[PDB]
């Protein structure tokens, strides 16, 4: 009964782990129905339901069940458990764009962790608050792209502070991989702030750490962020090197979409470098992938770029064909380039 619940809940857990989360949710619900006297078990079922709904994209449900877990955890005076629930709920609220509320939940996690003297839990809370403010400033910037307001800078600034606090604690604890995560997010946040030199330094440390761990994916990310940072410092040769490294990693990892974007970035960067032939090879690569992937929007960008690249070298007729291709795919801009080449 309580044992019925237990078996149902364990099968629920096992099924989410094996990536059958929709069936898992059904077992958690059967387990609730069967009922139990053990609050620690019930609370764990609420939590697993909240995470399974999160992963399935049902954020309202996830929020509901995390809340049930949270409330039950207060009611059981399980402080470490309450801290987890708060962290989970805060994460859910963050994804829903409910940043004020998310921050409150994540502060609570931080408060409890420090009361308990649980440094790893404190670290996590700091990283999560970093994520809330980073997502908030990113969102504010996107929602009004034509302005770079105090609200954006303020959000990103708090994010920097939390990430730095996290990084320092991660250094004190000697948690190398966690240092790598903090550097990556700090690098991103400074990059949004426009402190491109600070972003560089943090992405570089991120790359070093990734290499220590043989973490190729993190290496790819870091090299990509570096390339972008270099572009934003006017350092075009460094950018080209980092994009090429990105490209080589993306081929090794079989990330075809990322291989495409790296190629497109290299075409642009070589155009700035006035290496039109070399740009054209990179753009040709991007174009072929975009075609293979049925990504028409990329195919238009490629045609647009390739039209320009060809004219630049007097390849005027070829240029015309890409411009016409761009028109089809697309309109205003291609018509002008198609007219200008006649």
């Amino acid at each position: 009964g309580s044992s019925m619940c237990l078996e149902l809940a364990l099968e629920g857990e096992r099924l989410c782990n094996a990536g059958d989360c929709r069936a898992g949710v059904a077992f958690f619900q059967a387990a609730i129905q069967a009922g139990t006297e053990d609050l620690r078990t019930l609370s764990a079922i609420y939590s697993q339901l909240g995470n399974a709904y999160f992963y399935l994209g049902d954020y309202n449900k996830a929020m509901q069940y995390h809340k049930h877990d949270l409330t039950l955890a207060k009611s059981m005076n399980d402080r470490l458990g309450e801290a987890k629930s708060s962290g989970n709920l805060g994460n859910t609220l963050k994804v829903m764009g409910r940043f004020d509320e998310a921050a409150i939940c994540c502060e609570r996690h931080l408060t409890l962790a420090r009361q308990l003297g649980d440094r790893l839990s404190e670290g996590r809370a700091l990283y999560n608050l970093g994520n809330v403010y980073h997502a908030k400033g990113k969102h504010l910037g996107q929602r009004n792209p034509g302005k770079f307001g105090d609200d954006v800078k303020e959000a990103l600034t708090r994010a920097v502070e939390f990430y730095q606090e996290n990084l320092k604690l991660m250094r004190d604890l000697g948690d190398r991989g966690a240092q790598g995560r903090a550097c990556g997010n700090l690098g991103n946040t400074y990059y949004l702030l426009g402190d491109f030199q600070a972003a560089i330094e943090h992405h570089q440390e991120r790359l070093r750490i990734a290499r220590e761990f043989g973490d190729r994916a993190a290496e790819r990310r870091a090299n990509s962020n570096l390339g972008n940072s270099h572009i934003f410092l006017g350092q075009f040769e460094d950018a080209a090197e980092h994009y090429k490294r990105t490209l080589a990693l993306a081929v090794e990892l079989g990330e075809r979409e990322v291989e495409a974007q790296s190629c497109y970035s290299l075409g642009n960067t070589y155009t700035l470098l006035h290496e039109f032939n070399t740009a054209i090879e990179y753009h040709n690569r991007h174009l072929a992938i975009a075609q293979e992937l049925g990504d028409r929007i990329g195919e238009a960008r490629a045609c647009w770029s390739l039209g320009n690249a060809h004219s630049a070298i007097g390849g005027h007729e070829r240029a015309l064909k890409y411009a016409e291709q761009h028109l089809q795919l697309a309109x205003x801009x291609x018509x002008x380039x198609x007219x200008x080449x006649x």
């Binding site: 989970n88 999560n128 949004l192 994916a217 990310r221 962020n225 934003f232 700035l272 801009x333």
Partner: peptide
């Protein structure tokens, strides 16, 4: 409009974020 300026402008708000899930699991 110019493809290079357009590309660079798109890059301004780009960045590969850290990907580790921070959800916490309560074991049954």
């Amino acid at each position: 409009p110019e493809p290079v300026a357009s590309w660079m402008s798109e890059q301004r708000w780009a960045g590969e974020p850290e990907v580790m899930c921070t959800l916490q699991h309560k074991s049954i």
